[PDB]
mmCIF file of C-alpha atoms and ligand atoms in Angstrom:
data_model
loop_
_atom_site.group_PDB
_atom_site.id
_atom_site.type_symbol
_atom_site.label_atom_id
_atom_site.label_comp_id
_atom_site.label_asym_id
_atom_site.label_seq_id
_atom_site.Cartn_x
_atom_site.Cartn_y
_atom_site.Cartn_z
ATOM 1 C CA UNK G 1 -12.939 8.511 10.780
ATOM 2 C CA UNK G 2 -13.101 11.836 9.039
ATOM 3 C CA UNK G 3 -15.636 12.069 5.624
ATOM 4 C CA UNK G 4 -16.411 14.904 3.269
ATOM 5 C CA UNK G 5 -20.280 15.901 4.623
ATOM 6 C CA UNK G 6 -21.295 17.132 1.118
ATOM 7 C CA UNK G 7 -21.509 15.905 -2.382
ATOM 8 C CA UNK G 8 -19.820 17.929 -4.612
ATOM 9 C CA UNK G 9 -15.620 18.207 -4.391
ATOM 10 C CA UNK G 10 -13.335 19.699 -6.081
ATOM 11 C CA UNK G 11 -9.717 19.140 -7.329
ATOM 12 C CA UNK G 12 -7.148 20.816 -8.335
ATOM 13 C CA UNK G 13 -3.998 19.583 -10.587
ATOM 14 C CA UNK G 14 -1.349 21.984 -8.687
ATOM 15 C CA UNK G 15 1.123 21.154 -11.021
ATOM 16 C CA UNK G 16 2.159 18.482 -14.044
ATOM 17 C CA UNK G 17 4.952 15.294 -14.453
ATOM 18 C CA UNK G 18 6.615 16.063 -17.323
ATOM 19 C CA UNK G 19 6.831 12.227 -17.573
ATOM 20 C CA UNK G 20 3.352 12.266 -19.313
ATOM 21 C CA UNK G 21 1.565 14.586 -22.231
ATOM 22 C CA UNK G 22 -0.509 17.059 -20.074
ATOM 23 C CA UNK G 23 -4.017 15.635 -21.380
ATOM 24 C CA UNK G 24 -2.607 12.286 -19.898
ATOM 25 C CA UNK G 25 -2.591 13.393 -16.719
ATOM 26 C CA UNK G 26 -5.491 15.525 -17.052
ATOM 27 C CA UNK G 27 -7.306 11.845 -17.939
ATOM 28 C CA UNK G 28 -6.076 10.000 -15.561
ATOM 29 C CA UNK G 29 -7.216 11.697 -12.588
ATOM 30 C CA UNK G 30 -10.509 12.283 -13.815
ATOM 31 C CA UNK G 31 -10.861 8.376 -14.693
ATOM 32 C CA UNK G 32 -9.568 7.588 -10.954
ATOM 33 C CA UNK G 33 -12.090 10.007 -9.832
ATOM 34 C CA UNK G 34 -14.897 8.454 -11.631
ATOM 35 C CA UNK G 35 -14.110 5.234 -10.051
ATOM 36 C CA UNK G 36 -15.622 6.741 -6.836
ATOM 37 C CA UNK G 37 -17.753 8.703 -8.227
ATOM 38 C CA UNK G 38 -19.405 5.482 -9.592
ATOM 39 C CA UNK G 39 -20.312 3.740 -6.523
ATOM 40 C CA UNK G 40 -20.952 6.958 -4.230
ATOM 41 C CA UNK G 41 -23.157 10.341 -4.194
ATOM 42 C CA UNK G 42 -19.947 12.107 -4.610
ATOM 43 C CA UNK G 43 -19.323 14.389 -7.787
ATOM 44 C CA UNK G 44 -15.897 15.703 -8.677
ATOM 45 C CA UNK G 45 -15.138 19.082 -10.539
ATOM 46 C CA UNK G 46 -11.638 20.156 -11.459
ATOM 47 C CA UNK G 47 -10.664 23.234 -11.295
ATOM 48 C CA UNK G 48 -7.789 25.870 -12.450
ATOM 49 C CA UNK G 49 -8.114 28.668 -9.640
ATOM 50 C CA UNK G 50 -8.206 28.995 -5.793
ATOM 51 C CA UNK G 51 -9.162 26.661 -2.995
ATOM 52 C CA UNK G 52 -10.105 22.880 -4.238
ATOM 53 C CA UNK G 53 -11.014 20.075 -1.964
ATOM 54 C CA UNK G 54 -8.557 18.142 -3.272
ATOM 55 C CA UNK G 55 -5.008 19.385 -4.231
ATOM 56 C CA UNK G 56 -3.052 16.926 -6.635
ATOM 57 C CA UNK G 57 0.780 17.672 -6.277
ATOM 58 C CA UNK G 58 4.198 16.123 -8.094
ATOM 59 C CA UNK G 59 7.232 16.184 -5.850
ATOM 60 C CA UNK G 60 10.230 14.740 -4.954
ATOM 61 C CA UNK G 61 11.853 14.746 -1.864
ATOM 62 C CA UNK G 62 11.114 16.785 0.936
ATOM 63 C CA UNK G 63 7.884 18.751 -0.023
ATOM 64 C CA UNK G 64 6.633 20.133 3.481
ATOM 65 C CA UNK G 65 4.375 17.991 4.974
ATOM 66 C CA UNK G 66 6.091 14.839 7.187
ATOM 67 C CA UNK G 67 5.792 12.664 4.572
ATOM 68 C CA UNK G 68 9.107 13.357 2.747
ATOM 69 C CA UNK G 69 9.735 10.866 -0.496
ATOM 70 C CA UNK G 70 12.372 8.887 -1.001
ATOM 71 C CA UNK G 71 13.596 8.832 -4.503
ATOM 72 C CA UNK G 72 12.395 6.451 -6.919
ATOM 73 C CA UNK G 73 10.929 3.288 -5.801
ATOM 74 C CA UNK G 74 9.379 2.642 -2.401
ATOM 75 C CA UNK G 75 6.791 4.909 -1.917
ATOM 76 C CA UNK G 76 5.024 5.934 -5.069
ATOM 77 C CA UNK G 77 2.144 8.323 -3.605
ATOM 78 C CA UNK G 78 0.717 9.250 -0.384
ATOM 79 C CA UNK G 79 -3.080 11.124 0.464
ATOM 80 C CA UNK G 80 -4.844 12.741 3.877
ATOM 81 C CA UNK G 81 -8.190 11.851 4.518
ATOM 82 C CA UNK G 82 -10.876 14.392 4.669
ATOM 83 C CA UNK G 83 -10.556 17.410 6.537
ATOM 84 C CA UNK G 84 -9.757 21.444 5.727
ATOM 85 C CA UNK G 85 -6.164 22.763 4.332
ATOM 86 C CA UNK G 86 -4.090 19.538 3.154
ATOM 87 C CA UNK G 87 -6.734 17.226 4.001
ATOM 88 C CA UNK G 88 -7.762 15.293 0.942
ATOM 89 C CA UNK G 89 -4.691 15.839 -0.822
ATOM 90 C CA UNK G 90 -2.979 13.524 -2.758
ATOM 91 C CA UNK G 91 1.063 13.572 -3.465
ATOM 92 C CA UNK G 92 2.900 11.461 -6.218
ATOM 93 C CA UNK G 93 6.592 11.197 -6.282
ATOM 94 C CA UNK G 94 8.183 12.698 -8.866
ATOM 95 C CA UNK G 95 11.142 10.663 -9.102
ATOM 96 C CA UNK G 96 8.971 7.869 -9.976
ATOM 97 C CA UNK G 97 8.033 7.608 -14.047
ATOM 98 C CA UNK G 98 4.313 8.307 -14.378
ATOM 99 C CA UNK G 99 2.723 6.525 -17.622
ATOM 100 C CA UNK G 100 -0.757 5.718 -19.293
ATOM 101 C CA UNK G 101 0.845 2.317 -18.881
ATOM 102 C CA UNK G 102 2.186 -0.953 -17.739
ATOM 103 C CA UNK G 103 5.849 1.078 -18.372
ATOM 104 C CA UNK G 104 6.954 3.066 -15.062
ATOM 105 C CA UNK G 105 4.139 3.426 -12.628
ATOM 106 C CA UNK G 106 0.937 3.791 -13.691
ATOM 107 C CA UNK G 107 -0.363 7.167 -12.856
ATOM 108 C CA UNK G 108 -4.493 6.162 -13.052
ATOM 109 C CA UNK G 109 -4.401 3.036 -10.902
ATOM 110 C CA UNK G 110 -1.806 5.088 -8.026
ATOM 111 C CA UNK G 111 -4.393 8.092 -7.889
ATOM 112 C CA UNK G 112 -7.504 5.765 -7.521
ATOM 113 C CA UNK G 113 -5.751 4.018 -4.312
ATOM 114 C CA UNK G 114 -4.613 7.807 -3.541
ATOM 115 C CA UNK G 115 -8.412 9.062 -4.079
ATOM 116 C CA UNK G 116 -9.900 6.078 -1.691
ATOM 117 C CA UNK G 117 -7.505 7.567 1.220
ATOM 118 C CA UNK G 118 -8.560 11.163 0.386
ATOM 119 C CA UNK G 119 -12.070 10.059 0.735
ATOM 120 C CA UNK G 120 -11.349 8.291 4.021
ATOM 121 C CA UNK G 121 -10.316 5.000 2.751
ATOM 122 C CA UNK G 122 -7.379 3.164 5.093
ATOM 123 C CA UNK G 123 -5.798 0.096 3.453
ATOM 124 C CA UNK G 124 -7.045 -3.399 3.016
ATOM 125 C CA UNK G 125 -5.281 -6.806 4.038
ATOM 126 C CA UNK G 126 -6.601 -8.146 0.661
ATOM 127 C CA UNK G 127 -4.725 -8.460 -1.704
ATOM 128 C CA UNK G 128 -7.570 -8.534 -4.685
ATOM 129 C CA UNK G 129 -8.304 -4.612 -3.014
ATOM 130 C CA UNK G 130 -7.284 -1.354 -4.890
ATOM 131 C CA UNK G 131 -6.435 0.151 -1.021
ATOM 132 C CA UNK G 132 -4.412 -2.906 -0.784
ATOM 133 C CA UNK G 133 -0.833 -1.456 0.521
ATOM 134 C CA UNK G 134 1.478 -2.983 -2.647
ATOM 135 C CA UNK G 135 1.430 -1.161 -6.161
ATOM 136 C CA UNK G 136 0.742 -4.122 -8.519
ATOM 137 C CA UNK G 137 -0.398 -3.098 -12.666
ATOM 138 C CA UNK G 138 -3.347 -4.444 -13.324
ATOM 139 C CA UNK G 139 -4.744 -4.027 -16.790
ATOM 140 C CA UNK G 140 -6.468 -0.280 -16.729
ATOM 141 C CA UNK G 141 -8.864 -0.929 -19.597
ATOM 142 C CA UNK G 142 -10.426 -3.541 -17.128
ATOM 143 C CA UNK G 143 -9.943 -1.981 -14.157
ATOM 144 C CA UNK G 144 -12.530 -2.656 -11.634
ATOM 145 C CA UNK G 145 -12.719 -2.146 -7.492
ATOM 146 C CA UNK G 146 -13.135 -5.242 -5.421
ATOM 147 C CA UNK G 147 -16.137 -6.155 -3.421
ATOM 148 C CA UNK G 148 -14.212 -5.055 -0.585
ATOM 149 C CA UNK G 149 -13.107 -1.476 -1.950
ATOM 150 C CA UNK G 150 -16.712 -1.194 -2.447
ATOM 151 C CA UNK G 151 -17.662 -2.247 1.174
ATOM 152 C CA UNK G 152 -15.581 0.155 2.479
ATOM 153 C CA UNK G 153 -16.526 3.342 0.466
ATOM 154 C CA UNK G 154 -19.928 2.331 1.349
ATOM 155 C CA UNK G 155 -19.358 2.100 4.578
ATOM 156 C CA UNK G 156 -18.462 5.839 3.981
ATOM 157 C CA UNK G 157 -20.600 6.996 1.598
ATOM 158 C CA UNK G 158 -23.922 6.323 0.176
HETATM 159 O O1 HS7 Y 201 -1.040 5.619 -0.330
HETATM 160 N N1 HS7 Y 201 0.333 5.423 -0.260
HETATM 161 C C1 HS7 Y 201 0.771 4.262 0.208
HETATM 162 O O2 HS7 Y 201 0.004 3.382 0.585
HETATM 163 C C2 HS7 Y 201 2.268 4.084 0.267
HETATM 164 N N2 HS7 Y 201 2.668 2.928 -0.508
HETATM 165 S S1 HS7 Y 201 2.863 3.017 -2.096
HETATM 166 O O3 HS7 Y 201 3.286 4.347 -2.450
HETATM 167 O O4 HS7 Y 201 3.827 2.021 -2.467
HETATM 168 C C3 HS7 Y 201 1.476 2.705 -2.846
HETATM 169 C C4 HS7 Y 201 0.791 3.709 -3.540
HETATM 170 C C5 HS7 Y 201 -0.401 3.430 -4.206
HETATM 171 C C6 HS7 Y 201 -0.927 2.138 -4.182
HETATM 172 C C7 HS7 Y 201 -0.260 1.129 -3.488
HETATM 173 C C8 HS7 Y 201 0.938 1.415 -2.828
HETATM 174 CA CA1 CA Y 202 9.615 6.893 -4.276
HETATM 175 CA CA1 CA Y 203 -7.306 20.000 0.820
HETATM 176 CA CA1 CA Y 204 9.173 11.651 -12.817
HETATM 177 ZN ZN1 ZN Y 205 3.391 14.832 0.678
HETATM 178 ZN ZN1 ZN Y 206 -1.970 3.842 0.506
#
């Protein structure tokens, strides 16, 4: 399946929740980042002005893609893999409540399962997995990929 052939991607944050302080979200991408970045060659750079890698959107409904949302609940978030123009992209529903926390949904641990599919992650059958299909909190002071996360972006990458 498709991978990014070079080492340094970028991202861009195309627009904010206003469920969150702006340095919240700003954090919490780069943390879910980083938990790639840590077990991979890949380096991520945000940035504020034309053509990223990686586009981070919030919307709600019908957004223009095929992947329409569905109000709150159900589907929190959905990513492409790897490829040019909305490949690697990563959308979070906005009628979902984005937090820091165990309160709402928990923006870091949704954009690190989000981030594995933009990097060309599918989902696991195991339930211990970050790409597993089912949002479940887990403590994000802790947080920490399974072995099999880590089998599969090395199976990728690295
Ligand atoms: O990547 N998106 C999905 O897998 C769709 N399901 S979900 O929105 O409920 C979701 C999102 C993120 C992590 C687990 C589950
Ligand atoms: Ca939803
Ligand atoms: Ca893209
Ligand atoms: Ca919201
Ligand atoms: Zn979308
Ligand atoms: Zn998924």
């Amino acid at each position: 399946g498709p991978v990014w052939r070079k080492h340094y991607i970028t991202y861009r944050i195309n627009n904010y929740t206003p469920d969150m302080n702006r340095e919240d979200v700003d954090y919490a991408i780069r943390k879910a980042f980083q938990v790639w970045s840590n077990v991979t060659p890949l380096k991520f750079s945000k940035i504020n002005t034309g053509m990223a890698d990686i586009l981070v959107v919030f919307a709600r409904g019908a957004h223009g893609d095929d992947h329409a949302f569905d109000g709150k609940g159900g589907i929190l978030a959905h990513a492409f893999g790897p490829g040019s123009g909305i490949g690697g992209d990563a959308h979070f529903d906005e009628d979902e409540f984005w937090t820091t926390h165990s309160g709402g949904t928990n923006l870091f641990l949704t954009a690190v399962h989000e981030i594995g599919h933009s990097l060309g992650l599918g989902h696991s059958s195991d339930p211990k997995a970050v790409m597993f299909p089912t949002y479940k909190y887990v403590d994000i002071n802790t947080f920490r990929l399974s072995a099999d996360d880590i089998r599969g972006i090395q199976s990728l990458y690295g």
